[PDB]
Write a protein that binds this ligand. Structure first.
Ligand SMILES: *[C@H](O)[C@H](C[C@@H]1CCNC1=O)NC(=O)[C@H](CC(C)C)NC(=O)O[C@H]1CC[C@H](C(C)C)CC1
Lengths: 298, 296
């Protein structure tokens, strides 16, 4: 039986209307236009030759307002420039007439968000990703994608949580939150940086097993249980995040009647392999669906 | 090494702007608003009581324009039936009607779906039209009228309007000429689904992605021609392989020939024998040649 559990993004129209192109000298990439502000990664200020140890404090001082061209496709007059962590905060003289209600909230590991991939300020595609416990994401990003933004939507309010900066050697990616911090504390310098060891997102694995139960596949449920604190002590030493319950997990426990503690026991038995059986078409544990995904799609 | 090969959907903004809610009596679902026309599935005419064997020609005759309510989160002054779809004329024109066309997608092709409930877009995902003319995706009650589309430039090709769920949890709908994909009937009755098959051209594209990603252990100088593969495929639950410029592009990027990989499919179909290809132990057939060219 097809569960109907798929990678789903938010409709991207609200964010498409905010995408612009920012050019500084030779460098061009994407920016996010909210009210009278345009956000973009600050390495747009860096010339290709000096990208390996940029002095950003000095580059900013050396700029005027005319050093930045901002174009909307999907010109703007830059009337201020400032720097916030790894991002530029440009002020423009026209308020984006299609600004959505929004917030800036950093996301934590295990949370999913949508990404609108853009090239020269033109949206080209959207996909969903999960912030990993080593503060990376997968997805698809090519040359020119920097400034592509990731977001969620709760109600009318968009939460902007990601602005794309870089690719790492193992092919994964990272970027900034809109408070300017880089996720994982990576530096926006063109140098090899090795990511930390990854981990399974325990709360998402729980959601996925609940999804399996809701889809009729529950051979792996036994009466046996492992408490949250006991699972988390075992988690530190076998590459799993701490489990923290939510009202969203709790809805799934109520619907199925299978308790969290039974699925934490199940996880301890399953992470080695399924000894010949499948769960939701898979033979490994899946951890990129969230409790909220499962409540919405099943 | 993460390949960068992911399920990617088209930006949905153009289509979000066309979604409306359609109500008829006590039923509601989604419709697509292009110029002065609102498209929606005809079973919006059916009382829930009578979904098993509706008489669509009698239901249409019993309606008036004032039977239908259109709300855009709109006054109907016309109504006709085309195949399994309604074509409602309303008095206001959609000003944000994108340039568009109407195409019927073939098996193996990918399109984007904008899933909507009560006229409100809620999610977007990419599906592949299976060789049995079903799709996966995520569709709950109220999702009918959700539309699938591709893009060729700024032009939107509307290819799908969601209609129903089959016994096994898969889905199907109409093309915009009013035909159901796979000739399924828009009635709430058990219907026999043909067994699925492997889309060979997509399997080839996935193997090319692997080679570009530096995973080429399966690449031998052995070759199978298209016609031997096709003969083999008929008996082994695969589709006819048809070459394309998109595929040729990948054989030129990698220096590996289509026939080398056709040979490879015949071996890997038996299993990878302890090895992996892009984190998988089974062949993957839902990434197209176009996906791979564009994403790698
Ligand atoms: C329109 O919104 C709706 C969507 C389906 C509802 C649930 N999931 C959907 O995809 N379509 C219908 O309700 C459709 C109308 C008929 C006139 C064709 N009926 C339908 O899809 O019925 C099916 C529901 C599920 C069952 C399974 C055996 C469980 C089979 C019939």
């Amino acid at each position: 039986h097809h569960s109907g559990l798929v990678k789903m993004s938010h409709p991207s129209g609200d964010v498409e209307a905010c995408m612009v192109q920012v050019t500084c000298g030779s460098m061009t990439l994407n920016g996010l236009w909210l009210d009278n502000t345009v956000w973009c990664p600050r390495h747009v200020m860096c010339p290709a030759d000096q990208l390996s140890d940029p002095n950003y404090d000095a580059l900013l001082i050396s700029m005027t307002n005319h050093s930045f061209s901002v174009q909307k496709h999907i010109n703007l007059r830059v009337v201020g420039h400032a720097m916030q962590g790894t991002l530029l905060k440009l002020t423009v003289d026209v308020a984006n007439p299609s600004t959505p209600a929004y917030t800036f909230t950093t996301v934590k590991p295990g949370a999913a968000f949508s990404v609108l991939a853009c090239y020269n300020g033109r949206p080209t595609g959207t996909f969903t990703v999960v912030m990993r416990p080593n503060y990376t994401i997968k997805g698809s990003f090519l040359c020119g994608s920097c400034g592509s933004v990731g977001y969620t939507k709760e109600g009318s309010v968009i939460n902007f949580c990601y602005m794309h900066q870089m690719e790492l050697a193992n092919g994964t990616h990272t970027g900034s939150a809109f408070d300017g911090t880089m996720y994982g504390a990576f530096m926006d310098k063109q140098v090899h940086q090795v990511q930390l060891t990854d981990k399974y997102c325990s709360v998402n694995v729980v959601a996925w097993l609940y999804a399996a139960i809701l889809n009729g596949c529950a051979w792996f449920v036994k009466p046996n249980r492992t408490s949250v604190v006991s699972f988390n002590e075992w988690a530190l030493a076998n590459q799993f995040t701490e489990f923290v319950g939510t009202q969203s997990v709790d809805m799934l426990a109520v619907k199925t009647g299978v308790a969290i503690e039974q699925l934490l026991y199940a996880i301890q038995q399953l992470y080695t392999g399924f000894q010949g059986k499948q769960i939701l078409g898979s033979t490994m544990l899946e951890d990129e669906f969230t409790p909220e995904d499962v409540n919405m799609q099943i």
